[PDB]
Ligand binder design. Structure first.
Ligand SMILES: Nc1ncnc2c1ncn2[C@@H]1O[C@H](COP(=O)(O)OP(=O)(O)OP(=O)(O)O)[C@@H](O)[C@H]1O
Ligand SMILES: Nc1ncnc2c1ncn2[C@@H]1O[C@H](COP(=O)(O)OP(=O)(O)O)[C@@H](O)[C@H]1O
Ligand SMILES: Nc1ncnc2c1ncn2[C@@H]1O[C@H](COP(=O)(O)OP(=O)(O)O)[C@@H](O)[C@H]1O
Ligand SMILES: Nc1ncnc2c1ncn2[C@@H]1O[C@H](COP(=O)(O)OP(=O)(O)O)[C@@H](O)[C@H]1O
Ligand SMILES: [Mg+2]
Lengths: 281, 1543, 97
């Protein structure tokens, strides 16, 4: 039972659902509980004097703000959800979130399309860290955009491929996918001409028939003279296995940005780390 | 608790069942039940009314049981009626868009269809009325607001379907099927018009006239889509000759025909159809050109699927599903909702991108979220897409009152009807409301997703969603759209879960050039391309080059307004050329007229009419240079609107205003008036921006009167101060319990205009918002000030703005308004240079010569005006004096009209003085020479007191010296005495003020009494000035340091006016107009005179002076507005306010306001609004100087020391010792260190009073004892509030130093034994007490205290003895309140209780708990006030800072501390009970009082004499500063004792 | 006339877009051209070694991020920013080519 916090009827529904689930063993999720900091305290006291069913679970989704009571934080286990640390982690999360049966479907090219989608999503989400240069503002390129892009890819591939096991890369509706991602899915958030130009950059560079060649490069001159190579596989597990063997030497050149873009940031955080190590002394 | 509920239920149910005489035919069984209920009700009315006694009816048996049965019956019948309303809403779901009372109105009025014709506008998109035959028995068709009608193929017969829901559903279905059939026929014809080399204009115009505006555009789109699809299917072979060029040429020739058509005169409906067709075919031409350039040869290429394509299948049996609209992979079926004649937008690249994104969102069964700055056309694009699919789109202007329940019911209506909800400003909701609404949105979207599954079949169970604990059917055609402006003020943050439910789209840069080009081309402008390419860069360069002003807007709305005005101007110029040709010759050729038409000149005229009025002076040359550069060689000269100009002349003459043409005096004002008229003609939302007193109000009033006298249409203006009332009182409230809507002020006015019972729609209605503008209240008018012209309320009601209504704002700035409001309003900028000072002088002189002040009075006024005319000219005495005074320093911001109004009031007082002289001397009236001398000297005097009255002495002297240098009036000849020290005698000669200051001898028993003033120069000057300002009833403000004597001066001046009764109000940080309303309820009454409701004081013949103690304390909101200050400004400038009980204008009579305040630079004080300060002269009362203080307290000391003759020679030194030390401390301890370190003559007054009390009983006393008393009082005054030890050491040392300096030959030890203790416990008199004897006495009294009262043992040290002595000192004084500041657990409460027990006071402490509220505090306050004011019981009310749970606690306590009464505490039966007990108490005392006013005065006096409030709080740094503003009386009415921590 | 030959720092002006508009207006008025048909061309030269014609205005303080300018041609660089010595903004008639 999912309940959104904020209204009196919401509090009544939350109380009723928790009271039912602590006996039945069902699950209760409460969303945006940070908007009612006072009620969270009575919720914590109610939870403390309670011996619910074995399978009962209570999830409280919230934003990271100081209004959340400290006692509630101590009473429960905290999980922080944020952008993945790097391109490899982002692509691994993307592949884990999408079901295996979805990627492995009638056309074998769907797996490579999904891999391209994951790489694209990882690149644009990782460029958000270098906010002045990677983009012009902190766009909210998130998981909903990834779902919309996956749905678009599925719909247009199914339309083009009437259940055929294999289709030619030139027959893939590249223009439809590129336009829908540059105008509706990812371009909807973009409110700048130059950010739109950069999105069109990435979409034209990545989504093309040339992405199905063995000589395709995902990125160029990442460090020195080597470059990221497009995997030659045709199955989802092979793409995931390629993602697992990423060098773990990510640089902003992976994103197309200059390598020095992180030099200030990686400096500040480093100094920041010292400060934290000094604050806990 | 049962009778009232049953009574109300029966009343409203009887009203429902009687107003609807046909409701019985559909509700039979409950009709019989209600007949039985009515018979029972008649039985009760026939039984209880015979005996009008409660005891006579509570003795009758069978009453309570029958009442309970009736209550149950009423509840059951109400529930049944609610279920019936729900069931009837289930069929024909459009009834979800009407209220329950409205639904019942249609239910009961099914027989007569005339009453139902006003409900179709809110149940249908474009159906305004239903066409019926003469019998009113069959529905022949439908009609729109524009008059376009659709004739049903098969009319709906009401006789064959008597039930309302059935024939309404049949009407809707017949609407859809008739629209489908007409669309099919129009498509059949336009196909013939298609695939043709040439098009006959006559046949095309005939086809356009035949079909509706919706259907012609739809058919053109269908034909073009079919042609393109056929061409692509032919070209699918690849590398083949393209017949797509044939489609492009067909579009081109049709565009040529349409462009030729719009050049010539057309009927308005045909012209709008031609414009829509031109726009659509221009878009088609652009799309075809893009397809040709891209070499698209496949119909399955995305360059063709990304477009909106229309497929028509005549083979479909269902005409509703006959048309399909497809964009990318999204498919929709045309809703066939009659939309009337809407304004089509230009399909720009952004619009296309918006269409694609929103259609993708719709296919995903999730909402759309277009975001961006205001004026990007986010809302219009959503409405245009909805109209493209034939959907019913409702726009809801959302605010924070759109709570969970309102949004839920809106969603229920949208689900049932199957309509599109465009929620504009969705971020104006609360974040918690956004989160709550996210759940409903998710449920609806999940239901839609389940509907879209192919496994579902329409024959199975319908899809329902859980909305508001109910199963609600969800139509597949529902859509939710939310347009929000990210970054604006008053906007909230959307939760992530809600954001994931919408597909967002950035609409930031509209394609302005394309819009301009297409709009100008559709209006008939030849060379529209060059016009657009000139006018869009012009707007961009105006945005870049011009200075940044808060009222500047050069976005799309501005260009849109410019383009619409350009089209209107072109039509008017064509008509003018036509009539000129008719009167000169007979040859008329419309093609020639179009050919030789200066289109660029028309565009320049439009730009000047729309952009120029808002420009500031420094930006006008820049914009005109931009015009000369972008449009070179073309010039526009504004037409001379003479016919309005003579009307303006006549109105100005009748209103004593100055009129000018061009460069004469007042010409700029008339130019601004004409600009305002043009903006009214072009805009339905206007705003008049400019500094206070720039002539805005007179401008729009004169324009209204001139328009009434020119057009013959009577003009009615409703003036509202939006920030003088709460937003709930402005727009309305929705009851969270009963879902009942109470209209606000603006809502009530608009609804009354719309109903037009008294012919309101036939009058020019102007709703002016004269007040501050912030996004909290003005954004609710967004949909009002937009194309929607609609006010949307949370209860789902939508009110359309009538065409005769203009929404106007009169503001002084827009620094807090967002761009959303600025862009939706035409701005007229009123600089201070528009209204010259000569204009104000002319107005004043004309009013003086015309309006009598009380005809001999008018003759005196005319003579005085003739005498003072030479000084009121340009570069005259007054003008130069004002210019110089603007260079001085004043206690408040100096505005021209404040000084000018002060001067005018003083001149009116001078005329009244001359009239009084003439009345006093009937034999010898004042002659012309004496009058001339008096008027000139008084003019100089009034200039001095009006232009420097709010300044210090040195500024006043500087202004006097400047006037002396520049004036020619005979002035006082003293080499060193400033002119400000003289007054003007009625004989016409300067006389020094010192002659009015006599050395008085105050009576011995009246030493330092509250109403005893020692005459001083400032006292006699300020008294005269206040008398002058009060006699005219002009509101005034006294500014100065606390304890400067503002209240004393005001009361002294009012003593000379016996016809005025003063009422004290003490403002604080949380003061709101409800305090004023309570004061009005207590002291005044409302009566309904034939002219309206008038609020006047109860005491006839008396003027009520509402004296506000701290007028600048009330808190400003985050937009720099004090609500109470705006309320007072409205009551002063408009002479009344609005009663929010019934939204009625109440006019004040015999009520005037006086304010007092500390300087605005003081902590906790805010500067007053310039629009408020314009009407209130400000007088600066400074602290008395050493000479004046020496005189005032020297007099009090002599009167005091007259008690002991042997000490009579020590009055002069003692006063000096009083004056010096008080000075030193005032320099040593300032508000910079601690907030409470405030020293004023008030401390010295207490000093003299305390020494006088000490000296009253003594028959004799040596000098050493007098010095000891002086030092003890100095310690109790200057040392008790000190925080640090070093400050108290300084106080001791300098007390000794001052005493030794002023009393050399004394015994130091006998007078300054450091334990200086005084008490009247050991003896009858207040003689000094020894520390050891005092300790023993306190020990014995503490033993008795333990035995009788609280038994907590106490340890006695010296500080305890000092503190109990101080508390005993305070409890022995009238209105003696304490503020003990110290650490918790230090014994403050215990010592206070012990001292109260010793003095016989009854200790009262409020018992605060978790459920303690304001009502409990009010009840406790009533209890204490009754006990201490009616029973004559001395009560020590002990309150701790932790007992406070709200600011209302501090408000009530502040009022009680300052005045001794709360004006609104006793209201209702409580007031009657209080009056009864007060009469009983007065009879007990021996006073026979009859009226409630004098009895309430006696009650207040008893409370003041008895109640002692002891406030205890911990010593917080910021807490004390906060309390100094929240409760000022805690620091001016309470004695502060700093106990601190134990030393 | 002297105000045309001075080199200003666009970052040191309260409203630099007003400066761009003013230069465009000056060029349009000098040549009696229409204001809307003027486009901007950029020429990067040394501050001392430069000449301003009737349409050229000098600008200093512009910084090129991630690129270097040689002979008025841009090349990618690994430096954070490169200081452009002097920038000549020259207003010309639009060619639509
Ligand atoms: N045409 C005129 N000729 C002479 N006096 C005028 C004229 N118009 C206005 N005045 C006077 O000048 C003052 C202007 O006051 P008005 O209320 O019109 O200004 P405002 O800008 O609307 O003020 P506020 O901002 O305080 O609401 C008044 O004293 C008014 O009587
Ligand atoms: N494509 C267009 N063609 C014509 N007028 C347009 C177009 N887009 C927007 N407009 C106009 O611009 C204004 C936008 O109003 P609105 O939709 O309320 O803006 P926003 O949603 O940005 O607040 C209206 O005057 C509207 O008619
Ligand atoms: N001429 C005077 N005669 C008597 N008292 C005076 C005179 N001038 C000043 N005072 C004293 O100044 C103080 C002013 O108190 P109050 O009227 O409350 O000041 P404010 O209105 O500035 O708060 C009183 O103690 C009053 O007795
Ligand atoms: N002088 C004192 N000697 C002994 N106990 C004291 C003394 N003053 C206060 N107490 C004790 O402190 C408590 C009362 O504190 P109270 O007067 O309520 O504190 P506060 O100063 O915060 O009002 C009781 O326990 C009382 O016996
Ligand atoms: Mg006004």
């Amino acid at each position: 039972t999912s309940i959104a916090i904020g209204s009196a009827e919401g509090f009544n529904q939350a109380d009723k659902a928790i009271n039912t689930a602590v006996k039945s063993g069902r699950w209760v999720m409460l969303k945006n509980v940070h908007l009612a900091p006072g009620w969270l305290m009575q919720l914590e006291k109610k939870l403390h004097s309670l011996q619910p069913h074995a399978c009962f679970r209570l999830f409280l989704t919230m934003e990271i703000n100081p209004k959340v009571p400290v006692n509630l934080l101590r009473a429960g286990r905290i999980f922080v959800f944020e952008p993945p640390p790097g391109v490899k982690a982002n692509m691994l999360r993307t592949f884990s979130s999408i079901p295996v049966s979805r990627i492995c479907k009638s056309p074998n090219e769907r797996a490579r399309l999904y891999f391209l989608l994951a790489w694209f999503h990882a690149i644009i989400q990782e460029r958000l860290r270098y906010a002045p240069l990677g983009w012009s503002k902190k766009y909210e390129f998130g998981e909903s955009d990834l779902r919309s892009a996956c749905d678009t890819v599925d719909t247009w591939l199914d339309d083009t491929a009437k259940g055929r096991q294999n289709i030619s890369p030139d027959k893939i509706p590249w223009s439809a996918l590129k336009t829908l991602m540059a105008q509706s899915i990812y371009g909807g958030r973009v409110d700048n001409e130059f950010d739109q130009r950069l999105l069109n950059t990435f979409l034209e560079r990545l989504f093309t028939t040339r992405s199905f060649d063995s000589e395709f490069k995902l990125a160029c001159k990442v460090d020195g003279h080597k470059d990221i190579q497009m995997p030659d596989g045709i199955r989802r597990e092979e793409f995931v296995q390629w993602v697992e063997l990423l060098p773990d030497t990510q640089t902003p050149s992976w994103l197309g940005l200059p390598n020095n873009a992180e030099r200030v940031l990686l400096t500040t955080q480093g100094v920041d780390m010292i400060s934290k190590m000094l604050k806990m002394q | 608790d049962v009778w009232i509920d049953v009574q109300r239920r029966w009343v409203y149910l009887e009203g429902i069942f009687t107003g609807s005489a046909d409701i019985k035919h559909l509700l039979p069984v409950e009709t019989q039940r209600f007949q039985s209920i009515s018979t029972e009700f008649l039985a009760l009315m026939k039984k209880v009314s015979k005996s009008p006694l409660v005891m006579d009816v509570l003795n009758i048996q069978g009453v309570q049981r029958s009442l309970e049965r009736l209550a149950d019956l009423l509840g059951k019948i109400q529930k049944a009626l609610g279920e019936y309303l729900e069931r009837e809403r289930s069929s024909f779901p459009r009834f979800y868009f009407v209220g329950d009372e409205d639904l019942l109105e249609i239910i009961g009025n099914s027989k007569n269809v005339a009453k139902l014709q006003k409900h179709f506008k809110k149940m249908f998109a474009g159906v305004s009325s239903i066409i019926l035959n003469e019998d009113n028995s069959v529905v022949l068709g439908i009609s729109s607001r524009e008059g376009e009608e659709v004739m049903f193929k098969t009319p709906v017969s009401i006789t064959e379907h008597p039930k309302i829901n059935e024939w309404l559903t049949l009407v809707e279905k017949e609407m859809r099927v008739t629209l489908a059939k007409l669309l099919a026929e129009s498509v059949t014809e336009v196909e013939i018009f298609g695939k043709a080399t040439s098009i006959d204009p006559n046949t095309y115009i005939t086809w356009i006239d035949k079909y509706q505006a919706q259907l012609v555009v739809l058919s053109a789109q269908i034909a073009w889509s079919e042609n393109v699809e056929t061409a692509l299917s032919s070209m699918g072979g690849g590398g083949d000759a393209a017949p797509l060029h044939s489609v492009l040429s067909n579009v081109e020739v049709t565009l040529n025909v349409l462009a030729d058509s719009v050049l010539m005169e057309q009927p308005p409906l045909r012209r709008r159809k031609l414009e829509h067709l031109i726009t659509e075919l221009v878009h088609q031409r652009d799309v075809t050109r893009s397809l040709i350039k891209s070499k698209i040869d496949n119909a399955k290429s995305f360059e063709w699927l990304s477009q909106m394509r229309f497929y028509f299948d005549p083979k479909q049996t269902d005409v509703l599903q006959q048309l399909s609209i497809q964009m990318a992979n999204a498919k929709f079926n045309y809703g066939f909702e009659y939309l009337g004649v809407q304004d089509k937008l230009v399909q720009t690249p952004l619009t296309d991108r918006c269409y694609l994104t929103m259609t993708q969102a719709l296919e995903a069964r999730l909402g759309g979220s277009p975001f961006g700055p205001a004026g990007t056309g986010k809302t219009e694009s959503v409405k245009a897409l909805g109209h493209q699919l034939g959907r019913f789109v409702l726009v809801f202007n959302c605010d924070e009152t759109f709570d969970f329940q309102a949004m839920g019911r809106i969603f229920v209506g949208l689900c049932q009807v199957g309509a599109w909800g465009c929620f504009d400003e969705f971020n104006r909701l609360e974040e918690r409301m956004l989160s709550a609404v996210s759940q409903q949105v998710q449920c609806i979207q999940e239901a839609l997703r389940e509907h879209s599954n192919p496994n579902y079949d329409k024959t199975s169970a319908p899809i329902t969603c859980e909305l508001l604990n109910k199963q609600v059917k969800v139509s597949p055609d529902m859509a939710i759209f939310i347009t929000m402006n990210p970054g604006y003020a008053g906007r909230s943050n959307l939760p992530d879960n809600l954001k994931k439910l919408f597909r967002s789209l950035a609409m930031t840069k509209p394609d302005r050039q394309l819009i301009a080009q297409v709009m100008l081309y559709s209006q008939g402008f030849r060379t529209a391309e060059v016009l657009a390419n000139k006018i869009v860069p012009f707007f961009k360069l105006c945005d870049e080059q011009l200075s940044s002003q808060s009222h500047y807007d050069f976005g799309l709305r501005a260009l849109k307004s410019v383009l619409v005005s350009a089209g209107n101007v072109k039509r008017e110029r064509i008509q003018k050329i036509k009539r000129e040709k008719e009167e000169r010759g007979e040859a008329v050729d419309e093609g020639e007229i179009a050919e030789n038409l200066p289109e660029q000149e028309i565009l320049i005229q439009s730009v000047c009419e729309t952009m120029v009025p808002k420009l500031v002076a420094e930006d006008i040359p820049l914009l005109f240079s931009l015009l000369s550069d972008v449009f070179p060689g073309v010039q526009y000269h504004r037409g001379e609107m003479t016919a309005l100009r003579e009307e303006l002349k006549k109105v100005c003459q009748e209103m004593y205003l100055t009129y000018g043409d061009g460069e004469e005096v007042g010409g700029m004002w008339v130019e601004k008036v004409l600009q305002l008229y043009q903006i009214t003609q072009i805009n339905h939302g206007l705003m008049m921006v400019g500094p206070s007193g720039s002539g805005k109000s007179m401008a729009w009033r004169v324009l209204l009167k001139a328009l009434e006298r020119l057009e013959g249409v009577e003009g009615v203006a409703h003036i509202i101060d939006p920030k003088a009332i709460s937003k709930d009182h402005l727009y309305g409230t929705l009851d969270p319990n009963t879902r009942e809507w109470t209209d606000g002020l603006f809502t009530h006015v608009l609804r009354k205009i719309i109903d037009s019972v008294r012919g309101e729609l036939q009058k020019r209605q102007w709703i002016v918002f004269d007040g501050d503008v912030d996004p909290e209240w003005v954004e609710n008018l967004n949909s009002v000030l937009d194309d929607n012209k609609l006010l949307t309320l949370p209860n789902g009601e939508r009110l359309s703005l009538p065409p005769n209504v203009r929404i106007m704002f009169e503001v002084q700035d827009l620094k807090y308004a967002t761009l959303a409001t600025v862009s939706r309003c035409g701005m007229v900028w009123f600089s201070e240079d528009v209204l010259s000072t000569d204009m104000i002088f002319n107005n004043f002189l004309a009013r003086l010569r015309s309006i009598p002040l009380d005809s001999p009075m008018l003759q005196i006024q005319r003579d005085a005006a003739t005498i003072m005319q030479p000084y009121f000219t340009s570069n005259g005495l007054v003008t130069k004096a004002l210019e110089h005074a603007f260079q001085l320093e004043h206690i408040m911001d100096l505005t021209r009209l404040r000084c000018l109004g002060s001067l005018f009031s003083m001149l009116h007082q001078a005329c009244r003085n001359v009239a009084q002289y003439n009345a006093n001397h009937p034999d010898f009236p004042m002659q012309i020479e004496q009058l001339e001398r008096y008027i000139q000297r008084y003019l100089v005097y009034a200039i001095l007191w009006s232009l420097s009255g709010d300044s210090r002495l040195k500024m006043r002297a500087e202004l006097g010296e400047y006037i002396r240098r520049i004036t020619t009036v005979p002035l006082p000849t003293a080499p060193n005495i400033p002119i400000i020290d003289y007054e003007v005698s009625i004989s016409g000669e300067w006389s020094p003020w010192q002659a009015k200051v006599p050395q008085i001898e105050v009576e011995t028993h009246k030493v330092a009494a509250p109403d005893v003033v020692v005459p001083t120069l400032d006292t006699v000057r300020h008294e005269a000035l206040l008398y002058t300002w009060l006699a005219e009833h002009k509101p005034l403000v006294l500014c100065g340091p606390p304890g400067s004597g503002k209240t004393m001066t005001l009361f002294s001046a009012l003593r000379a006016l016996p016809d005025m009764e003063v009422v004290g109000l003490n403002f604080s940080s949380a003061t709101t107009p409800e305090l004023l309303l309570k004061t009005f309820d207590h002291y005044c009454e409302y009566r309904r005179t034939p002219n309206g409701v008038v609020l006047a004081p109860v005491q006839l013949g008396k003027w009520l002076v509402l004296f506000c103690d701290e007028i600048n304390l009330p808190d400003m909101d985050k937009y720099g507005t004090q609500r109470v200050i705006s309320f007072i400004r409205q009551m002063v400038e408009h002479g009344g306010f609005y009663r929010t009980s019934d939204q009625t204008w109440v006019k004040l009579e015999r009520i005037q306001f006086v304010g007092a305040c500390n300087p605005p630079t003081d902590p906790g004080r805010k500067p007053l609004s310039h629009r408020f300060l314009r009407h209130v002269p400000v007088v600066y009362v400074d602290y008395p100087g050493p000479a004046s203080l020496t005189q005032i307290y020297g007099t009090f000391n002599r009167a005091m020391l007259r008690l002991i003759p042997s000490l009579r020679t020590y009055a002069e030194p003692l006063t000096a010792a009083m004056v010096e030390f008080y000075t030193m401390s005032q320099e040593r301890f300032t508000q910079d260190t601690q907030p409470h370190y405030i020293y004023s003559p008030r401390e010295m007054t207490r000093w003299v009073r305390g020494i006088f009390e000490a000296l009253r009983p003594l028959e004799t006393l040596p000098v050493e004892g007098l010095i000891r008393i002086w030092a003890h009082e100095a310690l109790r005054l200057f040392q008790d509030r000190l925080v640090e030890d070093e400050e108290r050491r300084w106080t001791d040392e300098n007390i000794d130093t001052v005493a030794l300096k002023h009393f050399p030959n004394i015994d130091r030890e006998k007078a300054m034994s450091r334990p200086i203790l005084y008490s009247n416990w050991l003896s009858k008199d207040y003689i000094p007490v020894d520390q050891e004897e005092l300790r023993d006495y306190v020990k014995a009294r503490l033993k008795v205290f333990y035995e009788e009262e609280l038994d907590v043992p106490l340890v006695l040290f010296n500080e305890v003895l000092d503190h109990v002595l101080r508390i005993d000192r305070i409890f022995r004084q009238p209105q003696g309140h304490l503020l003990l500041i110290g650490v918790s657990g230090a014994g403050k409460t215990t010592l206070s209780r012990f001292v109260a027990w010793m003095n016989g006071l009854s200790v009262y402490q409020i018992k605060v708990h978790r459920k303690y509220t304001g009502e409990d505090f009010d009840e406790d306050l009533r209890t204490v006030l009754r006990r201490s004011g009616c029973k004559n019981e001395k009560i020590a009310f002990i309150m701790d800072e932790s007992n406070v749970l709200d600011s209302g606690f501090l408000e009530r306590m502040n009022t009680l501390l300052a005045n001794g009464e709360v004006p609104g505490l006793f209201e209702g039966d409580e007031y009657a009970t209080l009056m009864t007990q007060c009469k009983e108490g007065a009879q007990k005392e021996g006073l026979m009082l009859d009226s409630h006013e004098e009895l309430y005065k006696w009650f207040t006096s008893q409370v003041i004499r008895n109640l002692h409030v002891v406030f205890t709080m911990n010593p917080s740094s910021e807490g004390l500063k906060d309390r100094a503003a929240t409760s000022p009386a805690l620091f001016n009415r309470c004695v502060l004792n700093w106990f601190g921590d134990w030393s | 006339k002297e105000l045309k030959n001075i080199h200003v720092c666009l970052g040191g002006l309260f409203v630099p877009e007003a400066y761009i508009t003013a230069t465009r207006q000056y060029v349009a008025q000098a040549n009696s051209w229409s204001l809307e048909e003027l486009c901007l061309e950029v020429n990067v030269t040394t501050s001392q070694g430069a000449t301003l014609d009737a349409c050229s205005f000098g600008v200093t303080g512009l910084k090129l991020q991630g690129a270097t300018c040689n002979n008025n041609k841009l090349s990618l660089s690994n430096a954070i920013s490169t200081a452009l010595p002097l920038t000549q903004l020259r207003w010309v008639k639009q060619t639509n080519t």
